[PDB]
Every structure is written in C-alpha cells, then in structure tokens.
Swiss-Prot record:
Top-level taxon of the source organism: Eukaryota
Similarity annotation: Belongs to the DNA repair metallo-beta-lactamase (DRMBL) family.
Regulation: induction: During mitosis. The mRNA encoding this protein contains an internal ribosome entry site (IRES) in its 5'-UTR. This 5'-UTR generally suppresses translation while specifically promoting expression during mitosis, when cap-dependent translation may be impaired.
Residues of the full protein shown: 700 to 1040 of 1040
Cellular localisation: Nucleus
Tissue-by-tissue expression: Expressed in brain, heart, kidney, liver, pancreas, placenta and skeletal muscle.
Organism: Homo sapiens
Protein's gene: DCLRE1A
Protein task: May be required for DNA interstrand cross-link repair. Also required for checkpoint mediated cell cycle arrest in early prophase in response to mitotic spindle poisons. Possesses beta-lactamase activity, catalyzing the hydrolysis of penicillin G and nitrocefin. Exhibits no activity towards other beta-lactam antibiotic classes including cephalosporins (cefotaxime) and carbapenems (imipenem).
Descriptive protein name: DNA cross-link repair 1A protein
Oligomeric and partner information: Binds constitutively to TP53BP1. Binds CDC27, which is itself a component of the anaphase promoting complex (APC). Binds PIAS1.
Amino acid sequence: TCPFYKKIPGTGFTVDAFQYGVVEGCTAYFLTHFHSDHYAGLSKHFTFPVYCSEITGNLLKNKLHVQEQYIHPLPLDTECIVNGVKVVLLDANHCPGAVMILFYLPNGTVILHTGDFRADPSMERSLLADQKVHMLYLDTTYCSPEYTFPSQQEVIRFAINTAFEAVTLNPHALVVCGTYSIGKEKVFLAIADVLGSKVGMSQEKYKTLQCLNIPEINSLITTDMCSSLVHLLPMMQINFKGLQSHLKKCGGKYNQILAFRPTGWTHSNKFTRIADVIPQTKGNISIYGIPYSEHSSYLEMKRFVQWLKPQKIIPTVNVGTWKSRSTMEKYFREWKLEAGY
Ligand code: NI
C-alpha cells in the first residue's frame, strides 16, 4: 500500500506512486522523473491523468507506450492549475526532465516535493525565493557528513583530460562509458566532443536519447558503432570480461580500452581527491570509477534546507530503518538550531 510520504495532504495528489494499483482518493498522479524506482507500474494500460515535464512525457509515450490522452505535460517555472490547485514545476538538477513540485494548498499551506535533486545555489533565485514553504518532502539520499564529492565540472575536466591524453598517445584506443538509466549524459558527450567523434550506442539507447530535447544531438550520437571511438554499453558490462568480449567484436580496429563507470559515491571519496583517482588495470584494459553525482552532497543539502527554513521536513529516501531515520532527524535539528529558524 502507498506510503504516507508519497501523499500530498489536502489534495487528491500522489507523487511517484504508480506501483500500488489504484490509490484510494487519488485524482492525479505526478511523476518527478523517468527513473525506474519512481515510474514502476506505468504502461500503455494506465488510464489516469499523469502530470510531468515535457521531457518526461516524451519518454512515457515513446518508451512505455502510455497513451497520449492521459499525459499532461507542464512547462517549467510557470503557475498552472491542476484539479483546482496551483502548482509549479522547477528544475531539479537531476537527470533530463527531472522536476521539483511546489503545491499551493487551498488553505494557504505551501509544500515543496524535491523529487530526486542535486541542490544548487541557483535554486535560491527561482520562484522559491518569493514565498514561505511550510513542508519539505526531501531527497535525503546522501544525508550524512561522510558523503562529500567534487563538482560535476571538476569530474568532467578529469574525464576529458584522461580520455584526450590516452587516445592522443594511442590512436587505436577505444573509450567505453557505462549507462543504465537516463542521466549523466555529460560524461560521454564531453569525451566525444574532445575526441571529435560521435558517441555510438544501441538502437534502444539512441531512441531514449532522442526523447530528451538536448540541442544538436543528431550531431553527437549515432547507432553506427564502426564510425565511433566512444561507445556506450550497459553498466553491467563494465568489467574486464565484458570489455575483453567487446574489444573482440571490434575486429582489430582497436587494441586498448579505457572505460568509465560514473558512480554516485564510493568510500574512496573520504580519502582521495579527484586529481588523485587511478584506474583498475588488467592487460590492455583500464577502468575508472568517477564520482559523478546527480544527488546533493551533505553540505549542498544542508545549505538548501538552511536557506529554505521549512517548518517540517519529510524524508523520502533511507526511510526503511530506525537507525537511518534517527540519524536524519538529528541532522535536521542541528541545522535548525545552527540557523535559528
Ligand atoms: Ni532518480
């Protein structure tokens, strides 16, 4: 049954709640972003209104075959009325098409649901700045001080410089990047751009990328692998066996693989600077784990909440254990006492 933290009080609305069958009293189902833990349950047989971004609605129609009459895309940064309630969708700085949702309840309460997000000071100057928020449904993925990671910009600089160096030294090296969902497209796009190549991929993955309104995409991606020296593969194939097998398939065009696994966090973050990251190597294959995150770090999350000053916080991640819940609640109290709200 639907958990409480997916229900918006005083409305007929739920958020990211498609795997519970028909939710009692739900008149509109919101979807923050097209990641499987959030869309789980949608298909061509869904007949209730779904409210989402334009990008998310492209992916629902083309990838899951949801019928067009039940998709309600909304523009960003625009006041809209849904079943008698004012809502705004804001950019979440997560994956393409990901939003945060502001609900203006009939009784004067204002609620922000962050979906999944990477907090940023740029958010302090959206339509959030203009009114008080009473309740915050917060992406608490990395809500503990051990979770530090670099800026996205520093990680992309590392990747571009590493790839460019390797292929200039050996023009017969192939670069491979892992993927299993939308998000983190800058990794493979930035590498292809520095090398003057398109990114090659499966037909399924090309289809997914064509849904995302990325400018000049026909210019950066392709299904012709033979013409590309940056290849995208499923994340599960980014290991020595799977990469040896792929190299076999390229027919002696290449004699070395440099592969990238964009992870969120890994404990090598608590000790090592991005400058200092090294690969795992076996023979002519090297694998780099790079800490490219599309969730808030602890410090980024703290700064956002201390700026927003909500009256109540409802965590949406790590809610299944008492030890996690208690940890989280202790940090929320610290933040409130330090800032004075
Ligand atoms: Ni997500």
